[PDB]
Amino acid sequence: DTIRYNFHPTHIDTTSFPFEQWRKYFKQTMCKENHRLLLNGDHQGEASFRREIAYYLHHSRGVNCTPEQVVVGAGVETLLQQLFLLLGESKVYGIEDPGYQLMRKLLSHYPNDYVPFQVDEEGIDVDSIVRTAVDVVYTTPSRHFPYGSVLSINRRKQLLHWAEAHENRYIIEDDYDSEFRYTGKTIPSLQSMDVHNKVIYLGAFSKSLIPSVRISYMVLPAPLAHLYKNKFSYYHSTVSRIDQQVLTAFMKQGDFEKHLNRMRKIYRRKLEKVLSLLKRYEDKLLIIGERSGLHIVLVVKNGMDEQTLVEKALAAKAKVYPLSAYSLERAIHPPQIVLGFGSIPEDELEEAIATVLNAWGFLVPRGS
Amino acid sequence: DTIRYNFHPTHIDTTSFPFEQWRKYFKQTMCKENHRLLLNGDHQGEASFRREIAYYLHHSRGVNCTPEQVVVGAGVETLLQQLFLLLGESKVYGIEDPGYQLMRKLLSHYPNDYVPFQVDEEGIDVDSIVRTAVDVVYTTPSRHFPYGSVLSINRRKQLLHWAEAHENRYIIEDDYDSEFRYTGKTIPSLQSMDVHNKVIYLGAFSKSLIPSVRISYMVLPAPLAHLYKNKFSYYHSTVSRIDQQVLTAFMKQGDFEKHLNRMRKIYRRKLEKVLSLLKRYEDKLLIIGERSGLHIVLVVKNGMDEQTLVEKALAAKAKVYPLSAYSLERAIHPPQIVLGFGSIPEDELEEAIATVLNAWGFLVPRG
Numbered sequence A: 001d002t003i004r005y006n007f008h009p010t011h012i013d014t015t016s017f018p019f020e021q022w023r024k025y026f027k028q029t030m031c032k033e034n035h036r037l038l039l040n041g042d043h044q045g046e047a048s049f050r051r052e053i054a055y056y057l058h059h060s061r062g063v064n065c066t067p068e069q070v071v072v073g074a075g076v077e078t079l080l081q082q083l084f085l086l087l088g089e090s091k092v093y094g095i096e097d098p099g100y101q102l103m104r105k106l107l108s109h110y111p112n113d114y115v116p117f118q119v120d121e122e123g124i125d126v127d128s129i130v131r132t133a134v135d136v137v138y139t140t141p142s143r144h145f146p147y148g149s150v151l152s153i154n155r156r157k158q159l160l161h162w163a164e165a166h167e168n169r170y171i172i173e174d175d176y177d178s179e180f181r182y183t184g185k186t187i188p189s190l191q192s193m194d195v196h197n198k199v200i201y202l203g204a205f206s207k208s209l210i211p212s213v214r215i216s217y218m219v220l221p222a223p224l225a226h227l228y229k230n231k232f233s234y235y236h237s238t239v240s241r242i243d244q245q246v247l248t249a250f251m252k253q254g255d256f257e258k259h260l261n262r263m264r265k266i267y268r269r270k271l272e273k274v275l276s277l278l279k280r281y282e283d284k285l286l287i288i289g290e291r292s293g294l295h296i297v298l299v300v301k302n303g304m305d306e307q308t309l310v311e312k313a314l315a316a317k318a319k320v321y322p323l324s325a326y327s328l329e330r331a332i333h334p335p336q337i338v339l340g341f342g343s344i345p346e347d348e349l350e351e352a353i354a355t356v357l358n359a360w361g362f363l364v365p366r367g368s
Numbered sequence B: 001d002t003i004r005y006n007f008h009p010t011h012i013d014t015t016s017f018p019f020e021q022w023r024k025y026f027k028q029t030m031c032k033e034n035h036r037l038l039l040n041g042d043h044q045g046e047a048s049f050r051r052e053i054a055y056y057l058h059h060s061r062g063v064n065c066t067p068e069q070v071v072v073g074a075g076v077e078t079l080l081q082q083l084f085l086l087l088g089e090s091k092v093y094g095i096e097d098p099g100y101q102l103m104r105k106l107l108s109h110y111p112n113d114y115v116p117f118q119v120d121e122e123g124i125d126v127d128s129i130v131r132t133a134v135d136v137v138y139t140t141p142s143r144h145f146p147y148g149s150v151l152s153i154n155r156r157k158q159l160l161h162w163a164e165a166h167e168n169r170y171i172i173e174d175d176y177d178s179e180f181r182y183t184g185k186t187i188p189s190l191q192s193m194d195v196h197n198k199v200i201y202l203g204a205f206s207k208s209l210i211p212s213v214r215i216s217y218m219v220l221p222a223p224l225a226h227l228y229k230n231k232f233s234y235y236h237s238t239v240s241r242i243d244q245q246v247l248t249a250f251m252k253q254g255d256f257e258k259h260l261n262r263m264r265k266i267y268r269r270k271l272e273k274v275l276s277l278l279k280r281y282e283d284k285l286l287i288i289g290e291r292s293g294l295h296i297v298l299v300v301k302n303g304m305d306e307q308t309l310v311e312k313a314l315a316a317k318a319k320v321y322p323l324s325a326y327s328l329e330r331a332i333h334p335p336q337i338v339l340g341f342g343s344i345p346e347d348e349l350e351e352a353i354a355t356v357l358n359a360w361g362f363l364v365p366r367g
């Protein structure tokens, strides 16, 4: 087949993107007067761009950093690799389970060991971490993937305390999941509470902007930033100067911020339509983390197993994501599926959900 | 200050670039109909783009590979890092001395050890390699930096033989420096001779095209390519899909090839003007590797040391490159300076060289 509907958690609404503006800024940047942009710039990122990042992160997340603490790289994986090299071979990493598997996967190639920790309604299990001899804790405190959990303000304090207790300890705050929250109290970055230079902040222009441009940023505590600038002095940027300059302009003249607001509205509509439809099956489908992100988790009580649910959906030309993809515990029961609605066009949402539900043997409204 | 003249060996003629065409292809690619390009593509590279790479490499260098053996990454450094992880922690690397320091520097972060080998008129010292217990040999056979040496056809055969002798051995062929040769025999890739899946081929769109776009490629022997696709299945591309698509088009419709020819002419003129001027001081300045690349080496007999020469040049706002920057084995005397003329505009060449010569206490023709 070709797959018709792709319920990917990290997809964006591609049809909505401001092509005209982007093209405009491209036109302004890529031209004879800016010919010097064709040579390589600062490895760490263009100063202009690092500046906008620090501005953006302050407004949006409460992050406090200088431009000289911002490292720009081609995707989160590029930056974590540099981080692993930077912090050294002895560090032991604690990671969330379940969660995105990237961190564990990358660590398989590096000397460093890892330890998984549970996440619950209040975030990562700080009690276990404290007993465990990890040095660096990787966590998504703002909204855990996939369930949407927030790291409670107590645990934030406890974790920062843990980090303060030793010179070797750090926290990696992953905010890959960009700022589409609709419900709950809006709570800031853990980095914003950090007064001890303990938190490394990680994010990307993927769920905002454009995933395929591969533009990501890591914010280092100022000692690490100095060490970074020394260790990696001879490297080159892994992100196009042209693209940096373009995004710099897009941000400076306010269009990025307009984009974000416009998209927030669109995603809100989509999510609400999706919930509107799914809430009708409340006996056999339970939704988790419904008021955050571009995706939800369904617990499915069809007596169909996880694998069956995936295959049936794929047969209907709809790709859906088994939660076991994101888990080291091999038993997930009842079966859970992640659905993301970024790429599903707004006017086809009902049809798309219908397709999946139908393939799963649910009764479906007309026009699918 | 700002530096007025930057004699960087890897710089290109930025003023010459086809902005209009590039912008055209950008316009064609980045638009509502191609909205799916905004999601991430194949980690290894866009199939269209890998295809053009395989085509390009065949016509230009005689490289024989499938698109599925081409890995696209953000600069040579990104790809070598993946390579180091792929081949494992036990491998020992041999590297050229002198040369670009990137390889040594990267290796400092990985478990892997390295050994430098001399380069002469005929390329890397294969005799030493054979005695040495290295597993992977890094070399720039087409045109060594900075002197311009070519790996002789004997040594090519000897090195491939060396590689054939053991299951663990490989050769990294760097063709970062590939396109601008004017003199000597135009000679093919070592990869083209490889029939034993021993050569990893490495190149980039920097000296052609645009350095700052950070688009590079590594061509893996087919067993390694299969291992790569498995080991790194979960990675994402480090190069923008949009930029891939743009360059894909630029290549397909022949604009890349036009670009290359146009640039070859320009660089040739610049080099010839530079030689024309410098040949006048043949007693105190000797030129090396003069008929290759976007740069030359000067041996300077001023009794000024290397450092002095650099500083004097920088005073008067010209940046020049000490050859010691490129060596692991012992201080060079008499001083050598690398001058690259990629970025120096054609109509300012005389002025620029004059600036440097003047600062070094030489007499200047035209006042």
Ligand SMILES: [Ca+2]
Pocket: A107, A108, A109, A110, A111, A112, A113
């Ligand atoms: Ca490991």
Ligand SMILES: [Ca+2]
Pocket: A146, A147, A148, A288, A289, A290, A291, A292, A293, A295, A296, A297
């Ligand atoms: Ca959710």
Ligand SMILES: [Ca+2]
Pocket: B107, B108, B109, B110, B111, B112, B113, B114
């Ligand atoms: Ca090493």
Ligand SMILES: [Ca+2]
Pocket: A074, A213, A214, A238, A239, A240, B074, B214, B238, B239, B240
């Ligand atoms: Ca890139």
Ligand SMILES: [Cl-]
Pocket: B252
């Ligand atoms: Cl063709």
Ligand SMILES: [Cl-]
Pocket: B306, B307, B310, B322
């Ligand atoms: Cl110097």
